[PDB]
Amino acid sequence: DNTTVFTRILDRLLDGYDNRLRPGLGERVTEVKTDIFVTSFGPVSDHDMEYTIDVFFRQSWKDERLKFKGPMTVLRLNNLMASKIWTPDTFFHNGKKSVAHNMTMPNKLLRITEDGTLLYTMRLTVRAECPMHLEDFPMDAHACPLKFGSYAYTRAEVVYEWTREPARSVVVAEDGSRLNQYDLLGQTVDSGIVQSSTGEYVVMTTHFHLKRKIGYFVIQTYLPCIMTVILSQVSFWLNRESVPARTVFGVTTVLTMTTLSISARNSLPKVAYATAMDWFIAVCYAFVFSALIEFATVNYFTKFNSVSKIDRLSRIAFPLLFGIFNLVYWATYLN
Amino acid sequence: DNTTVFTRILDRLLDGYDNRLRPGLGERVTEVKTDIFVTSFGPVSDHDMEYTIDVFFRQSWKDERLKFKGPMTVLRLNNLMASKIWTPDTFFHNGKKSVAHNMTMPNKLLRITEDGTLLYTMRLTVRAECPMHLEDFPMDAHACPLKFGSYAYTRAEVVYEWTREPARSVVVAEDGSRLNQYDLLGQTVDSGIVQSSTGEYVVMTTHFHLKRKIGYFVIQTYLPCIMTVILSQVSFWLNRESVPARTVFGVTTVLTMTTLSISARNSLPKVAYATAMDWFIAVCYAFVFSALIEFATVNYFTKRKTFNSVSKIDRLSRIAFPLLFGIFNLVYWATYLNR
Amino acid sequence: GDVTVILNNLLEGYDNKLRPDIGVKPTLIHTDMYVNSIGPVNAINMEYTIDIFFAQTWYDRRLKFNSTIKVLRLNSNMVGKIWIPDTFFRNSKKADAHWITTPNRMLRIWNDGRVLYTLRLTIDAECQLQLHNFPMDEHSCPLEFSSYGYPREEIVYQWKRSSVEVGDTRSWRLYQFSFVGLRNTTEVVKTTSGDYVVMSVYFDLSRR
Amino acid sequence: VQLQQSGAELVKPGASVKLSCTASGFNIKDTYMYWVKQRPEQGLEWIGRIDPANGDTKYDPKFQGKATITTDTFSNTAYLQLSSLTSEDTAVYYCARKGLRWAMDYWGQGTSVTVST
Amino acid sequence: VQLQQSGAELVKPGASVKLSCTASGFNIKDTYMYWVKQRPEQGLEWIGRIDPANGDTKYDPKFQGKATITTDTFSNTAYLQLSSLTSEDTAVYYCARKGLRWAMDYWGQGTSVTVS
Amino acid sequence: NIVMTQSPKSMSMSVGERVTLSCKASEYVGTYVSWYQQKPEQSPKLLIYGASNRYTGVPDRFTGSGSATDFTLTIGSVQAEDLADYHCGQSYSYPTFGAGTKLELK
Amino acid sequence: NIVMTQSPKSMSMSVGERVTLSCKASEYVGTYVSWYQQKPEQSPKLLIYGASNRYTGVPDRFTGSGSATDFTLTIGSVQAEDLADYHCGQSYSYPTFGAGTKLEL
Amino acid sequence: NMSLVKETVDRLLKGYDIRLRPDFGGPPVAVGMNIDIASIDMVSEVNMDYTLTMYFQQAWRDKRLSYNVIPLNLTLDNRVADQLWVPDTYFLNDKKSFVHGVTVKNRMIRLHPDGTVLYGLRITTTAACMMDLRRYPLDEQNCTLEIESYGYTTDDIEFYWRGDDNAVTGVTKIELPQFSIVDYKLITKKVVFSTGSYPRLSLSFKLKRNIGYFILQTYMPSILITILSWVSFWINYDASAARVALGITTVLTMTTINTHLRETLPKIPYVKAIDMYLMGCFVFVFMALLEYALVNYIFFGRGPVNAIDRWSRIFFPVVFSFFNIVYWLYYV
Amino acid sequence: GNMSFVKETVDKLLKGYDIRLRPDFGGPPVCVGMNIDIASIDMVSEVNMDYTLTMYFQQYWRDKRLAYSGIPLNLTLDNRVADQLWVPDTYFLNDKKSFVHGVTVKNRMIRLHPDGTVLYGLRITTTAACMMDLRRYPLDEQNCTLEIESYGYTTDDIEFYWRGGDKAVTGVERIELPQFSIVEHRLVSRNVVFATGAYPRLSLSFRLKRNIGYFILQTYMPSILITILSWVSFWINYDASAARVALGITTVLTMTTINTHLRETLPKIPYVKAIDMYLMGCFVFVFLALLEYAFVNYIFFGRVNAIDRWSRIVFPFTFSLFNLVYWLYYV
Ligand SMILES: CCCCCCCC/C=C\CCCCCCCC(=O)O[C@@H](COC(=O)CCCCCCCCCCCCCCC)COP(=O)([O-])OCC[N+](C)(C)C
């Protein structure tokens, strides 16, 4: 028939083909050329120290057993052909759980050119590990990696390369940014050798540089803490004799600053060190407690009844020391 | 070639074998001897009315088509000859989502004795249903059942029996206790016949007797309720002229009792009856609201050189209100915790 | 033996792609249901769980045998060898059969060609719950099923007078509701691929 | 089908006795054997059991060290082994096998032992 | 394994010159072909890139327009087109094969152009 | 150890009337309670295996009844061949028996 | 673009001691540098690829090193036949080259 | 007739090449698409996705699967899809999808005598939809579903809607809890990647949020709390405890309501309309408390007072009514 | 060429290979050596009482049917030939939910050494079950095990050992848990006996002490200074009833709110913890401060400065004695 010509080409290609053996198993090294098209950089989970990334992982390699001569130079075939030829066993070193999509058909590609050059594209959703150091939180930047390489074939068997220049071999789409908390500054690739128990392997690294935005935490943490400190210092402008009024400033500011301290350190996972936000909370929590101690000292010295020199000193000393702390802290951590 | 013999034996045993038919299809009833080894009685989900029991589900039956004569009387073959031969289609009647474990190889075995006796175990995690009655929460006891029978095969075709004595045919491992708030007292087994629209089926019933431990609920609910109603007694020893102090006592104890009543119900399913913890919380709420009404009457009988005196209403309520809480609390624990 | 040669003669020259009477008359399927336990009725997500024993009965002239054996009581190994209808539940958000320790399926073939196929299913079907007059609310939670590919001209479903059957109705997880009664209906829906016979089971629930 | 036992015997006190139980119609590899002590004008008392596929024997605590249970695989029989008989041990011995619901359905014809002078 | 280039060229400024180098022992469809400029007593300067299997070319932005790179399949040859020759174009040209980990593996002998 | 108690010890009833009989267990036995037919100078014969499950080859008048602890054997109409004592035995654990209740005709 | 700023222009020492080079990058090039020698009237030859990889035909005295931005080439006991010019390039992006480090007596 | 159907289906599947698309060397195969929307479940802002259940259906022409004797359309079993060529259509903005498998896998093939293959599936997909929440909760979300071929370029396959306006239906009977589908559009185009140019269909919906739930449980509590703050102006200045307690509890309830909503939305770094309103309300309440602080300082403070709270009884209801005019004229 | 000899060698090896029979089926048991390269422990949940462990699980036995002579190199075949070879039925007894990674192919390695030795390795993520004794939470150390066992083969059919001795498990010194910290790891080889036979078992177990400074930043410091907050009430005068009652009541409500809020992330354990004992002691201190005020009001307005001076000294002195008892018994 009209389509039997390609049928006999495929049946001649697969006749006597051993897919258990890589091309040049005993003669040379199977070089595999790789590039990544990031269709969407998904959300970064702070709690699990991971990130999600959607790709068009492409691999290309030379196989001399898939040479053909026909009327068509490139055989654009489906996914069923890729299970009958040798394909490299590329896995992600720092992945946790990634899905190769197969709706509605398996999201794969296979194009066999006439010189034997192959191309094998896949749709993946990699949940890789991003080890984080939350010491400058929330004003911190990250270098979340994506390391991939072969699983069974060592450095002497299968090597990996980038098919274009390394600056252009990982492309992120323009609409593809599902980051809401961070922003993507750029990509960074590298190639190296990893040593393991079984042998030495070629590993290819892609570093995605992230930077957190503080907009949320300057509305759900920093500004309520500043307003709690300010409202704890408006109790210095009152009457000395109003004991329950200044008492209820002291207790309500201490309780709400405690509640803010609980509903802040809880956002992220449980780390042993202290973030910059915890230092801001601790200094604020010291300021409000000092205001309470100031009222307690004034009330131990009340008995007409003159205003207090402690109140007149604390009307000036407390806000200027809070401003000095803010101008130190923000200039230290933003720079 | 020292293995060629075993290969031939297995090829002879699978030659002409029909695995769609039970052994003794035309002459007898296939009896299946079973025994459940509870590797670990997993956690009980009280919200879903379900429990999980990881087990080594063993089965054994006689198959005359697998008789052989060779070097080893018992052949400990792989778990892949299990799909080549007939195996009983045992399913769990009250199961919800059970997982035969597949890592790394599928966790089953198969031993074929030379007389045709087969042993076929598998490891499973059976999330099952344990209908609970919550009238004595949180000091209730339950008997979570585990029923399993022969789907597809009626008592005239496949019957089940315990391979050891029925008191000894379900064994829980010493470390099989992944139960946080419960206490597995013991297990009892039974056998029976259910009747359905398709025929009469043999069902094997295993009951696991659990008893809840009141250690979380005493710290979480009972002790804060007792401390809140004791905190309501503090307002009786104050002064009648401290109207803001005593109304702060009253409204903060009422709000504490409401948030305890809300936060004690979410651990339970949304049932349509009152538990024993609800009857404790309601009486504690009555004693807090009675303290608030007590302060309301004291404030209504408040006048203010004559000076105001202490209240006879407060003098009796300093003694009676702690006493009638201790009278109630002595009869509440004797009714529920004793029996 | 005897059942082996019967099964081997039945399954030779058999295509499971073609329904019985592919060009003669529509296939009449008599369905029966046995509700084990209507599970929790979720209000924030608007679905309910149901555990049933779905049984279907149709006639296959290619599965006729003449022997002293009347019924071939088979396991689930024979289900994928013969034609079974593509019954799906039209309002089910997700559902699964049960596969432990074996596929929980049954197949019995009589000597006149009658095939009974029973399987155990757990269905999270959608049930629209009106929240007006909460909590004095009465609902008719449906369960609609039909054939996916076969229209009215090819597969016609039909209930049995006592097809729907409930259990003891006291171990069920219905906490705040109460099972009042049930009713069965059949109708023809029109889609973009043909006309399909749809069978519905309505579960009336009053809140306690 | 048929369970046969040895004939009635006379033994002096302090000696030993061996009583056989022959089973026919079925192999003993799939069912357990049970031996029952039956005193004259008195109820039934269980002595012990055996699994012939393994040789595992379990005993009544009050018959511990008095009886020993032996089954021959080839001759399709089971043998009593009583070591130190007393003058009280004058009763009838019953051979039974496990049935459908752990119930002794098929029983032997019985053999009355007698310890006297 | 040998990259043989053309000879030395001497033309008037403002003209055009055809320059070429032939790769033997392999095929140029696998690896990229790189062109480089070496001024005397100066460092190396990159001219452009060509992919013979794809036909794509990429050039230095300071060398865009005045130089372009072509290729053919049957002769296995890389070609240069130089336009509007000036005094600063007096240099020696090598064609470099892309190698292991992007390394400029093989090099030609060198073609020196001179203007007058 | 589980002990079985049978009551009453004996009764003398006429031919053709209802006779009930009771057995009780100290510990839980599920349904594994058996009944036996001990005719004088013959071996015991099984009557009901399990709780309320009649054996093959016995008359229909023998009806069993079972629970977790209470077990009842009833005869709808006693004939002249029922002059024998009945034994109750459990099998949920290692098997034990009752005492045995005799029957006789006036 | 990427700018290679290898230093110094030339070093004039004897034969049989340790001499090192340096190559500093303007932007990131990650283990993608390449080192070549340049004899007078001779085409460049490859010595080191990647960051520290010895090419075939290179003696063991030529040891390279690399990092994210700073690169170096250390020579152990340089001989008389190694008196040539050394070049540092990059290929992480479109390739650029440095000026050149020479050797003298 | 069953034997004729059997031998015809046997002839159609003999010599069939699964690996070659209809017309492997000739023109691209045209695949028409119908979608019947059955449900939209879980339009979500915290995970930025929506769950969609549909009766996806594709229709192309295969000249190898043509028959002439039989005069009706053959609905084969759902398991013949492993033997026939089907397109490799995927969804680009997809996250997690499945075909329903009770009681069998919910797919369908109905061959036609001219060669047309009526293939269809029942797919529940969780498609990604990035949500622009500057104007939350008075926003309008455009959620989309990009339908693309994977391995076959424009010169190998072409996509079209089977009807182009009635191809996707069932949308008008979709009821969402807190959204309302205003418009839906069908767009066909081609996307170009580095491997080739691929055909694309995109189905998009214009969701609109319902204001009423939010106007009863986020706006009106804040409004009533700001009204309750001005009750302190009518209380006499000597009672410090009542005014201080009223202002402090007003600040505390304002700080809590906002924190009761943001945790039900993403960790976005921008300010939303509801957050702007509850920031302005907090400013008004804080200025009421500072007004009482000024009253206490001007009487019991700097000493050796009925006009400041007289001005605040008039000025404070005016500006907050003025702020409501400015806020509801922008976000509408 | 070489790939013509390799093809016929591999085709000769698996022609006649019976996958249902272990090597030396009628003879001595096969010895399977194991080493584990631990990638990273995802987390150690106390609510579910489990921990998720990603590992490079490798096995090592010698099959004499897979011995070749002509090829002088270690054949690394494609990972799909492992479905045609015999592999041991190793399972994890405390496993709950686990999977072999399957992107871009199934993450497993096969390698045939010329003497017949096989190097079957897999990449495996186990959510193994680890029962925790939270009686000293959060100042605790846990012992989480992984239980490697053969299922179908007894000790007369298979033998397990750690290959490399104490150097079989590598990578435990590099993992960074955010809340815990690995102290020791041990390798144990046993034989456990079931009713079906005696089975070999390898047990890998870690010791996990808990980092404490998060709990100082979270729970110990608010609970330690709400107690400081309650002692301001002694400085307030006796007639100021509203202030002292408000301070005592808000400290009581804060302590019980902290106690209810903390125990929502802990399993319903029936035993008291260390942090629950601390929060109960601080609640007793706050309750005693409020009862001290109640004893004062009742004393003056119900018939004072000496009682208020004595409680101003005793209450910080007794609370520091409570902290010296608690932080020396649990440390
Ligand atoms: C409880 C309710 C309270 C309501 C209050 C109502 C009134 C106020 C209402 C609202 C106004 C304030 C909130 C606006 C929030 C959105 C804007 C924002 O985030 O800005 C930026 C913060 O960038 C920074 O660098 C943060 C600076 C923090 C300053 C904190 C205030 C001053 C502290 C000392 C004050 C006291 C000192 C003296 C004390 C006496 C966003 O930056 P980004 O997005 O991270 O990055 C840039 C974007 N990019 C990445 C695209 C390039």
The residue ranges of every structural domain in chain B are: 4-213, 214-339
- What's the CA angle centered on C203, arms C200 and C206, to 5 degrees? 155
Chain-centre distance for alpha carbon G79: 16
Looking at this protein, which amino acid is placed at residue H204?
A: S
The rounded distance, in Å, linking the Cα atoms of F78 and F62 is 9
The rounded distance, in Å, linking the Cα atoms of D95 and D107 is 6
The rounded distance, in Å, linking the Cα atoms of B224 and I246 is 19
Instruction: Say how many CA atoms lie within 13 Å of H275 toward its Cβ.
Output: 20
Widest Cα–Cα separation across chain B: 120
Domains of chain E: 2-115 (2.60.40.10)
- I170's CB contacts (< 8 A; 6+ apart) are A197, I35, I36, I37, I38
Q: Whose CA is nearest to atom 48 of ligand 1?
A: A213
**I14 in contact with A, Cβ within 8 Å:** no
The rounded distance, in Å, linking the Cα atoms of H250 and B326 is 40
Residue that is written with structure tokens 């010493």 in the block: B174
Q: Whose CA is nearest to atom 22 of ligand 1?
A: A215
**Nearest one of I243, I258, I228, I250 to I297, comparing CA atoms:** I243
The rounded distance, in Å, linking the Cα atoms of B162 and B160 is 7
Residue that is written with structure tokens 């919906």 in the block: H205
Query: What does the DSSP 8-state code read for residue D113?
Result: E
Distance A219 CA to ligand 1 centre (A): 7
Burial (CB < 10 A; 0-12, 13-18, 19+), residue B252, is buried
Do residues I63 and I81 touch, judged by C-beta distance below 8 A? no
Chain G residues whose CB is inside 8 A of the E45 CB are 97
The rounded distance, in Å, linking the Cα atoms of H35 and H147 is 11
- Angle, helices B312-336 vs B223-234, to 10°: value is 170
The rounded distance, in Å, linking the Cα atoms of F20 and F68 is 18
| Documented resolution in Å | 3.0
Q: Do chains G and C touch (3 or more CB pairs under 8 A)?
A: no
Q: Which residues of A are annotated as a binding site?
A: 58, 121, 237
Looking at this protein, which amino acid is placed at residue E61?
A: P
Indicate the pairing of strand A110-113 with strand A74-77. antiparallel
Residue that is written with structure tokens 């053996």 in the block: A21
The rounded distance, in Å, linking the Cα atoms of D55 and H42 is 64
Q: How far is A161 from chain E (nearest CA, A)?
A: 7
Residue that is written with structure tokens 């009647």 in the block: B93
Residue that is written with structure tokens 């829906």 in the block: C189
Q: Is the CB of H279 under 6 A from ligand 1?
A: yes
- G37's CB contacts (< 8 A; 6+ apart) are G44, G45, G47, G82, G84, G85, G86, G87
Query: At I114, is the secondary structure helix, strand, or coil?
Result: coil
Q: Which residues on neighbouring strands pair with residue E82, listed in sequence order?
A: E17, E67
The rounded distance, in Å, linking the Cα atoms of A224 and A217 is 10
Tokens in use for B33? 């001897």
Contact H106 C192 (CB under 8 A): no
Question: What residue of G is the nearest CA neighbor of A205?
Answer: G30
Chain-centre distance for alpha carbon B81: 36
The rounded distance, in Å, linking the Cα atoms of G71 and G33 is 8
Chain B residues whose CB is inside 8 A of the F30 CB are 166, 188-191, 205
Distances in Å between the Cα of I197 and the Cα atoms of B105, B174, I90 are 19, 18, 16
Q: Is the CB of A141 under 6 A from ligand 1?
A: no
Query: At I144, is the secondary structure helix, strand, or coil?
Result: strand
Chain-centre distance for alpha carbon G81: 16
Question: What residue of F is the nearest CA neighbor of B162?
Answer: F92
Give rounded-to-5 percent helix, strand, coil for chain B. Answer: 30, 30, 40
Residue that is written with structure tokens 């307002």 in the block: B235
G57: left (phi over 0), alpha (psi -120 to 50) or beta: left
- What's the CA angle centered on B253, arms B247 and B258, to 5 degrees? 125
Distance A215 CA to ligand 1 centre (A): 7
Query: At B103, is the secondary structure helix, strand, or coil?
Result: coil
**H294 in contact with C, Cβ within 8 Å:** no
Contact H195 A7 (CB under 8 A): no
Q: Whose CA is nearest to atom 33 of ligand 1?
A: A326
Query: At I285, is the secondary structure helix, strand, or coil?
Result: helix
Residue that is written with structure tokens 């203010």 in the block: B304
Contact A188 G30 (CB under 8 A): yes
Q: Is the CB of H252 under 6 A from ligand 1?
A: no
Residue that is written with structure tokens 């930077």 in the block: A211
The minimum-distance atom of ligand 1 relative to the CA of A183 is 50
Contact C148 H108 (CB under 8 A): yes
Q: How many CB atoms lie within 10 A of CB H80?
A: 17
Tokens in use for B238? 């104050």
Query: What does the DSSP 8-state code read for residue B131?
Result: -
Question: What residue of B is the nearest CA neighbor of C167?
Answer: B196
Q: Do chains G and E touch (3 or more CB pairs under 8 A)?
A: yes
Looking at this protein, which amino acid is placed at residue A153?
A: Y
Looking at this protein, which amino acid is placed at residue C74?
A: L
The rounded distance, in Å, linking the Cα atoms of I301 and E64 is 99
Chain D residues whose CB is inside 8 A of the F34 CB are 101, 103-104
**Which mutation among A217, A223, A283 tests ligand 1's pocket best, with the greatest number of atoms within 8 A of CB?**
A223
The rounded distance, in Å, linking the Cα atoms of D43 and D40 is 8
CATH number of G10-104: 2.60.40.10
Tokens in use for F56? 């093959």
Do residues I54 and I121 touch, judged by C-beta distance below 8 A? no
| DSSP code string of B142-162 | EEEEEEEEETT--TTTEEEEE
The rounded distance, in Å, linking the Cα atoms of H133 and B220 is 40
Q: Is the CB of A64 under 6 A from ligand 1?
A: no
**Nearest one of D110, D109, D105 to D93, comparing CA atoms:** D110
Contact I213 A272 (CB under 8 A): yes
Contact A215 H270 (CB under 8 A): yes
Do residues A85 and A117 touch, judged by C-beta distance below 8 A? no
The minimum-distance atom of ligand 1 relative to the CA of A213 is 45
Do residues A287 and A314 touch, judged by C-beta distance below 8 A? no
Indicate the pairing of strand D67-72 with strand D92-98. unpaired
I292's enclosing H/E stretch is helix I274-300
Tokens in use for I198? 């005696």
The rounded distance, in Å, linking the Cα atoms of G103 and G9 is 9
Q: Is the CB of A226 under 6 A from ligand 1?
A: yes
Residue that is written with structure tokens 């007793």 in the block: I284
**Strand boundaries in chain H, DSSP class E:** 29-40, 49-61, 74-76, 89-91, 94-99, 107-111, 116-128, 140-149, 157-161, 168-169, 179-192, 197-209
**Nearest one of E2, E17, E57 to E35, comparing CA atoms:** E57
CATH number of H213-330: 1.20.58.390
The rounded distance, in Å, linking the Cα atoms of E93 and E112 is 6
Query: At A290, is the secondary structure helix, strand, or coil?
Result: helix
Indicate the pairing of strand F102-104 with strand F10-12. parallel
B-contacting residues of D 25-54, CB under 8 Å?
A: 29-30, 53
Q: How far is G26 from chain A (nearest CA, A)?
A: 15
CATH number of C3-207: 2.70.170.10
Looking at this protein, which amino acid is placed at residue B11?
A: D
Distances in Å between the Cα of C54 and the Cα atoms of B40, B195, F3, H107 are 33, 17, 47, 20
Q: How many CB atoms lie within 10 A of CB G19?
A: 16
- What's the CA angle centered on A74, arms A69 and A76, to 5 degrees? 125
The rounded distance, in Å, linking the Cα atoms of C195 and I59 is 58
Contact H17 A76 (CB under 8 A): no
* Minimal Cβ distance to H248: which of A43, A214, A252: A252
The rounded distance, in Å, linking the Cα atoms of H239 and A244 is 11
**Nearest one of C83, C84, C23, C61 to H4, comparing CA atoms:** C23
Tokens in use for H127? 């498609």
Rounded (10°) CA dihedral A313, A314, A319, A322 = 110
Burial (CB < 10 A; 0-12, 13-18, 19+), residue H271, is middle
Looking at this protein, which amino acid is placed at residue B228?
A: T
CATH of H2-210, picked from 2.20.28.90, 2.70.170.10, 3.30.70.260, 3.30.450.40, is 2.70.170.10
Q: Which residues on neighbouring strands pair with residue A195, listed in sequence order?
A: A200
The rounded distance, in Å, linking the Cα atoms of C72 and C112 is 11
**Which mutation among A139, A218, A321 tests ligand 1's pocket best, with the greatest number of atoms within 8 A of CB?**
A218
Distance A218 CA to ligand 1 centre (A): 5
Tokens in use for A9? 């080409």
Please report all neighbours of D, defined by 3+ CB atom pairs within 8 A.
B, F
Peptide bond into A23 cis (omega under 30): no
Rounded (10°) CA dihedral D3, D6, D9, D11 = -110
Chain B residues whose CB is inside 8 A of the D101 CB are 161, 191
B111's enclosing H/E stretch is strand B110-112
The rounded distance, in Å, linking the Cα atoms of G9 and H212 is 76
Q: Mapped to the 3 state alphabet, what secondary structure does H268-311 carry?
A: CCCCCHHHHHHHHHHHHHHHHHHHHHHHHHHHHHCCCCCCHHHH
The rounded distance, in Å, linking the Cα atoms of I59 and I168 is 11
Q: Which residues of A are annotated as a binding site for 4-aminobutanoate?
A: 58, 121
Q: Where are the domains of chain H?
A: 2-210, 213-330
Rounded (10°) CA dihedral B320, B321, B324, B326 = -110
The rounded distance, in Å, linking the Cα atoms of C101 and A202 is 44
- Angle, helices B276-300 vs B223-234, to 10°: value is 10
Question: Which residues of D have a CB under 8 Å from any CB of F?
Answer: 34, 42-46, 49, 58, 60-61, 94, 99-105, 107-110
Q: Which residues on neighbouring strands pair with residue F64, listed in sequence order?
A: F73
Q: How many CB atoms lie within 10 A of CB B264?
A: 22
Looking at this protein, which amino acid is placed at residue C170?
A: R
The rounded distance, in Å, linking the Cα atoms of H39 and D102 is 56
- A313's CB contacts (< 8 A; 6+ apart) are none
The rounded distance, in Å, linking the Cα atoms of I252 and B227 is 10
Q: Where are the domains of chain C?
A: 3-207
Tokens in use for A74? 């490139």
The rounded distance, in Å, linking the Cα atoms of A236 and I290 is 27
Indicate the pairing of strand B158-162 with strand B90-92. unpaired
Q: How many CB atoms lie within 10 A of CB H303?
A: 11
Q: Is the CB of A227 under 6 A from ligand 1?
A: yes
The rounded distance, in Å, linking the Cα atoms of D33 and D104 is 9
**Nearest one of I35, I55, I47, I46 to I175, comparing CA atoms:** I55
Peptide bond into A138 cis (omega under 30): yes
Chain B residues whose CB is inside 8 A of the C176 CB are 270-272
Burial (CB < 10 A; 0-12, 13-18, 19+), residue B89, is buried
Tokens in use for I288? 């005693």
- B80's CB contacts (< 8 A; 6+ apart) are I19, I20
The rounded distance, in Å, linking the Cα atoms of C199 and C186 is 5
Tokens in use for H107? 């797919």
Looking at this protein, which amino acid is placed at residue B218?
A: V
Tokens in use for G55? 């090419």
Q: B–F: how many Cβ contacts below 8 A?
A: 23
Residue that is written with structure tokens 């392997």 in the block: A201
Q: Which residues on neighbouring strands pair with residue H145, listed in sequence order?
A: H203
* Backbone phi and psi for residue I290, each to the nearest 5 degrees, phi listed first: -70, -35
Q: How was this one solved?
A: cryo-EM
**Strand boundaries in A62-109, DSSP class E:** 74-77, 90-92, 99-100
The rounded distance, in Å, linking the Cα atoms of H81 and H83 is 5
**B197 in contact with C, Cβ within 8 Å:** yes
Q: How many CB atoms lie within 10 A of CB I298?
A: 17
Residue that is written with structure tokens 């370029």 in the block: H153
**What is the dihedral sign for C-alpha H302, H307, H312, H315?**
negative
CATH number of F16-104: 2.60.40.10
